[PDB]
Amino acid sequence: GYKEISLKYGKGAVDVKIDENMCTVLYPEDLPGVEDPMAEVSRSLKDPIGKAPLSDLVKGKKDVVILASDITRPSPSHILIPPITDELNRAGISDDSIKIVFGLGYHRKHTDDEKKTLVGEEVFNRIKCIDHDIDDCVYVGTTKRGTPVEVFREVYNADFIIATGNLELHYKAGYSGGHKALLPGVCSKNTIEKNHALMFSEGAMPGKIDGNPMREDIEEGGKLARVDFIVNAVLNSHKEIVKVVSGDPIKAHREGAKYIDKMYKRVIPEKADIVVASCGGYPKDINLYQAQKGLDNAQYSVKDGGTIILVAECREGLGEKLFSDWMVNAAVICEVLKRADIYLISSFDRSLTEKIFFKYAKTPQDALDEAIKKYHDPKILVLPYANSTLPYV
């Protein structure tokens, strides 16, 4: 036994020493970003998953709409959109038959400069770039979960809809991308409101599609809006494009989700009694609110009655105002995970750490030594990069 594992903590690192036969250490396999992203887009458009290529699908269309967004940054639009329009032009579709719609959801409209940023100045000059108008939607049906689907008129009017965006793990929708570009981004306040209520279901969790009510509602509303085709950028932890998937809004998305899974999903035979999770260093552990991203990932791998040891400096404090005010009087995950014990190894003192219901230890080793005593031959799981590593049972 007695393996030494170093865990990132703030701007440095700290060691923990574990019986090697008691523990297992899971690491992400962060792929490097492609050397030529636009060429990668072109590759995947010749290689569409679950659909014939754009060449065969858009013949004779006159109102192609491309969905882009920067609700989530960094947007891939300026890389994905030009190679798409190249394919449309190749198939005989002129720039007057092409339209780009930005999915605002609840957010404010874009300035001209911000639109040029999102699509590139050359696309902006050739092709109309239109902000979602949340007050100009058209009802197209209700999902089986009761979400009325009211789509922006520009999108409703289209004879062909190409959804673009990122594809990564999402803490509620399981994964981003696919039909998510349409629902709720270019839908009405009603669609956005009711769909968002599914966030609080028990199956709204990262890495889960089937049985995820939020993901299922999204893909359903997306299907009532008849999204035709997706182009999605698979990102790594540095938000670099490692892969592009194109084609059927369902099948292409599943392919993208397997690439994410190859990088970040670490399947686990059962839940551990002790989980040691580092956020991976400053500034991912800059404050407790941000450290939650590590804890939200570790929460699925600890047993009922288990112990999480969260290694996160939080030099800048509790973080976001509404989250912090809740902890001392958005925080949802911490509240859920309190069927286990949580040690916080941080720059906080014991009094503050305990005031927010964490257990306190000076170092991770001290926390693990006291936790190990509370269990009979505990299984120990160590997540050195918990902000991107998803243990999955």
Residue numbers in the entry: 2 to 330, 352 to 415
Quote the authors verbatim.
Similarly, the catalytic residues (D72, H108, H174, and K298 in LarA) are also conserved in the Mar2 and GntE2 active sites, strongly confirming our hypothesis that these enzymes use the same catalytic mechanism as LarA.
To investigate the basis for substrate specificity of this family of enzymes, we crystallized Mar2 and compared it to the structure of LarA8. Although Mar2 was produced in L. lactis cells coexpressing the NPN-biosynthetic enzymes, the resulting structure lacked the NPN cofactor and substrate. To better compare the Mar2 active site, which is poorly defined in the structure, we used I-Tasser19 to model Mar2 using the structure of LarA. The first region, hereafter named “loop”, is composed of the two residues just after a catalytic histidine (His174 in LarA); these residues are bulky and hydrophobic in LarA (F175 and F176), bulky and positively charged in Mar2 (Y172 and K173), and small polar and negatively charged for GntE2 (E155 and S156), consistent with the substrates they recognize. The last region potentially involved in substrate binding occurs in the first loop of α-helix 14 (α14), more specifically W358 in LarA, K351 in Mar2, and N348 in GntE2 that point in the direction of the substrate side chain.
